[PDB]
């Protein structure tokens, strides 16, 4: 009934360490008792906790010009359109509207997709280094 | 016939010079040089006498110089004049005109 317990049981699961009690009641307490809570290798010499939000999903970009964060040569928008594709994205066409919404309101787009091909992503690259379109695919 | 910078072409072919390739849409978004395509819209720089369908009468082209016609997708003469690109076609591979 209390996170206390919970932090009991994975001290005593865990050869009496208590910090390791400690990481998992915290990250139940984020997460939610019936959770995902991955174990992975790290790189430092203490253990860490590492909460992710949100939807995240290990898939880069597609083209490298299409960083506007100079510090963390991330790609950062507020207030983005996301436009969603089940099929491979190459006509001129197919792309052409949805950055016509995005430049008739200003707002930034995000292209999720199985891929950009080189039309589109000439397209792309060409608005996004031209006139200055806010894209990432 | 009539000559488009010292060129007149014969018989039934005319010369006619593509129109300016689309580079930015309505909305203000831009396209590749590459994917633009072959522009079949076109102005008649120069027409030729015409083909003799008949012995003894001359047929002269139905386009003249200074119309707005529509190319076909092939059928094109490449011709380099004043270091600029002009096209030859027949007098009958030409869809047709825009009046206006």
């Known amino acids: ?20 009690g400690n990481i998992i009641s915290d990250a139940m307490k984020k997460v939610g008792r019936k959770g995902v809570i991955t174990v992975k290798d790290g790189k430092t010499l203490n253990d860490e ?17 299409f ?3 100079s510090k963390g040569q991330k790609c950062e928008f507020q207030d983005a ?3 969603l ?14 950055l016509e919404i995005a430049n008739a309101h200003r707002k930034p787009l995000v292209i999720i997709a199985e891929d950009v091909d080189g039309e589109a992503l000439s397209t ?9 379109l806010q894209v990432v695919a | 016939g009539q000559a488009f910078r010292k060129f007149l072409p014969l018989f039934d072919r005319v010369l006619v010079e593509r129109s300016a390739a689309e ?3 309505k909305g203000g978004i831009m396209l590749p040089e590459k994917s633009q395509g072959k522009v079949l819209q076109a102005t008649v720089v120069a027409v030729g006498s015409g083909s003799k369908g008949k012995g003894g009468e001359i047929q002269p082209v139905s386009v003249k110089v200074g119309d707005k016609v529509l190319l076909p997708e092939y059928g094109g003469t490449k011709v380099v004049l004043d270091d600029k690109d002009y096209f030859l076609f027949r007098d009958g591979d030409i869809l047709g005109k825009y009046v206006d």
């Open chain 1, 81 to 83: 359109y996301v436009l």
């Open chain 1, 67 to 69: 960083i506007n964060t």
């Open chain 2, 23 to 25: 580079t930015v849409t």
């Open chain 1, 49 to 65: 906790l590492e909460i992710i939000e949100g939807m995240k999903f290990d898939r880069g970009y597609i083209s490298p010009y």
């Open chain 1, 1 to 20: 009934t209390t996170p206390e317990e919970i932090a009991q049981v994975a001290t005593i699961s865990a050869n009496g360490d208590k910090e390791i």
């Open chain 1, 124 to 132: 792309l690259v060409l608005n996004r280094l031209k006139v200055g």
């Open chain 1, 85 to 98: 594709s089940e099929k491979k994205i190459s006509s001129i066409q197919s792309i052409v509207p949805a």
